Design a protein around this ligand. Structure first.
Ligand SMILES: COC(=O)CN(C(=O)c1ccsc1)C(C)C
Ligand SMILES: COC(=O)CN(C(=O)c1ccsc1)C(C)C
Lengths: 300, 253
């Protein structure tokens, strides 16, 4: 288990770590988070008490370095940093643990939620979507736009998700206009899976990362990408069986984790009704249809 | 965006545009089978593609062989329309290609957009006027060429005959809509109005009779009365009580 120490907490803030969150008061003696499970990506996120417009955070993997958080009073945010002095870092962490100044990552042993939400998400792929090569961790916030959003404005601060556009030359073969528009299997299997993502694991990883950025940051472009990647599969008549069964599991845990009170802003009625009741895959997502009908029967 | 009454003059500006109507592409007769079931039999159709400024009518005849062995024909017909319109655009010199294509039915938007992806600068737009282009098959010469076709074929007509020598395209488009609306509402009566004087004929190279300016005024009045007379019959309305403002609103829209 690894640790992300904090130098201090000079401003009152709600701190998120993966699906968990807790409130820190102004100048409270808070010095970080311990017992973070090794083997998964993680996200540590922030929403300032005095300005809820500040929602931002960092994706990281403790296997890639020793990371800490320090508040910057000039830029007004909690910043992730890497410590290259390993003995220094271990010395800091041990003092903070001995003084019990850290919250414990509060995972229940039965609970596979975080694994289920991040199964296909890799830090190397995160760092290609979020371009800032001098750091081993990745900053995301509520306001960052996607490459696609910017086509329709600072390039260095964009989310470089894979552009999906159903009415584009990439999606439609000349001579197969009706076929390719009504059955997107070509675009899914040849253009996206074989051509761009190379395999379904990379596709699912981007889909899972888009959902998590939508839910943890209220990022609108991420929500668009998540729905587009779902609709592309559901609108394809020919999808590998293992992919449909895995998609059903992925979506089930995403719908299960979504806060019931944010459902009105994170779920697109048209996409979900199309996917569950009209698409080629309307009868292939049994677990997702069941949780959706029992949890959010209004949206449908 | 969508084309409505707030911009009628855009129709007749110098930006090339075409209306596309697909209502006569897929045409059927419904009949009983020997076993007492119901079946359809397709008959030849057409795509109605019209330049409203010049009167050019590019009439693509849809022969029943295009439906052979195909499923979901009402859906296919929209994509076949879009395929044929795209092929027409590609067949035209650059300087004759439209800058906009206005579809009369919103279900044509996605099929046409997808077929026109190679032409990103050609706007595909819907419209809010209820235009009677379905009545194109009530024009005897167009119906004849469609029904006689034995294979796919494109035919050209000026739907305005020689009217633009004497009137503007706005008035010509207005005259065409009143004529077609009359033919759609009461085809028998409209044709009686148009053809009841033997001394006024249709030139071999025209679609409509060779009326003088004053005769067109009379014809147009008779078409309005027909539309008003059918309105009264349909809705059990006494048309005598109607004011001129009321009559204009009924015919318009
Ligand atoms: C039939 O021959 C033509 O040239 C067609 N005409 C047109 O107005 C026209 C021109 C381009 S598309 C339609 C007239 C009837 C001469
Ligand atoms: C050029 O403008 C027009 O043609 C406007 N209209 C008419 O004049 C008209 C309507 C029914 S009979 C005649 C239609 C709304 C199109």
């Amino acid at each position: 288990m690894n640790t992300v120490p904090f130098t201090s907490a000079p401003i009152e803030v709600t701190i998120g770590i993966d699906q968990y969150s807790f409130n820190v008061k102004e100048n409270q003696p808070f010095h970080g988070i311990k017992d973070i499970p090794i083997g998964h990506v993680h996200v540590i996120h922030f929403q300032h008490a005095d300005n809820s417009s500040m929602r931002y955070g960092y994706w990281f993997d403790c296997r890639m370095g020793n990371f800490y958080i320090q508040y910057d009073p000039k830029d007004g945010l909690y910043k992730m940093m890497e410590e290259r002095d390993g003995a220094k870092f271990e010395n800091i962490v041990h003092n903070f643990k001995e003084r019990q100044m850290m919250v414990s990552y509060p995972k229940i042993d039965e609970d596979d939620t975080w694994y289920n939400l991040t199964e296909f998400v890799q830090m190397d792929k995160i760092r290609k979507i979020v371009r800032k090569d001098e750091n081993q961790f990745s900053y995301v916030d509520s306001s960052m736009t996607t490459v696609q959003e910017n086509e329709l404005s600072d390039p260095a601060h964009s989310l470089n998700y894979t552009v999906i556009n159903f009415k584009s030359r990439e999606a439609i073969r000349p001579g197969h206009e009706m076929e390719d528009f009504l059955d997107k299997s070509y675009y899914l299997n040849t253009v996206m899976l074989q051509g761009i993502f190379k395999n379904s694991s990379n596709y699912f990883g981007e889909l899972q990362f888009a959902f998590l950025n939508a839910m943890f940051f209220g990022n609108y472009g991420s929500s668009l990408q998540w729905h587009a990647m779902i609709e592309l599969i559901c609108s394809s008549a020919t999808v590998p069986k293992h992919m449909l069964d895995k998609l059903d599991e992925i979506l089930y845990y995403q719908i299960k984790t979504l806060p019931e009170q944010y459902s009105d802003i994170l779920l697109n009625e048209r996409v979900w009704n199309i996917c569950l009741y009209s698409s080629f895959q309307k009868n292939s997502l049994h677990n997702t249809e069941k949780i959706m009908e029992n949890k959010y029967p209004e949206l449908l | 965006g969508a084309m409505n009454s707030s911009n009628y003059a855009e129709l007749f500006n110098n930006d090339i545009k075409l209306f596309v109507d697909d209502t006569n592409v897929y045409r059927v007769t419904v009949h009983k089978t020997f076993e007492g079931n119901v079946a359809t039999k397709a008959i030849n159709g057409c795509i109605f593609t019209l330049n409203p400024k010049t009167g050019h009518l590019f009439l693509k005849i849809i022969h029943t062989s295009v439906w052979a062995g195909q499923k979901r024909l009402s859906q296919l017909a929209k994509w076949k329309t879009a395929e044929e319109v795209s092929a027409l655009v590609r067949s035209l010199p650059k300087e004759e290609q439209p800058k906009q294509i206005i579809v009369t039915r919103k279900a044509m938007l996605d099929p046409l957009e997808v077929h026109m992806l190679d032409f990103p600068n050609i706007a595909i737009r819907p419209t809010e006027l209820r235009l009677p282009f379905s009545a194109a098959m009530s024009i005897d010469k167009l119906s004849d060429v469609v029904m006689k076709a034995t294979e796919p074929q494109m035919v050209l007509f000026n739907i305005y005959d020689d009217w633009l020598d004497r009137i503007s395209s706005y008035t010509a488009f207005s005259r065409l809509t009143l004529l077609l609306r009359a033919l759609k509402t009461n085809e028998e009566s409209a044709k009686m109005i148009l053809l009841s004087d033997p001394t006024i004929t249709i030139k071999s190279y025209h679609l409509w009779p060779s009326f003088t300016d004053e005769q067109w005024i009379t014809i147009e009045s008779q078409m309005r009365d027909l539309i008003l007379t059918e309105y009264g019959r349909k809705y059990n309305v006494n048309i005598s009580a109607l004011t001129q403002t009321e009559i204009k609103d009924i015919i318009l829209g």
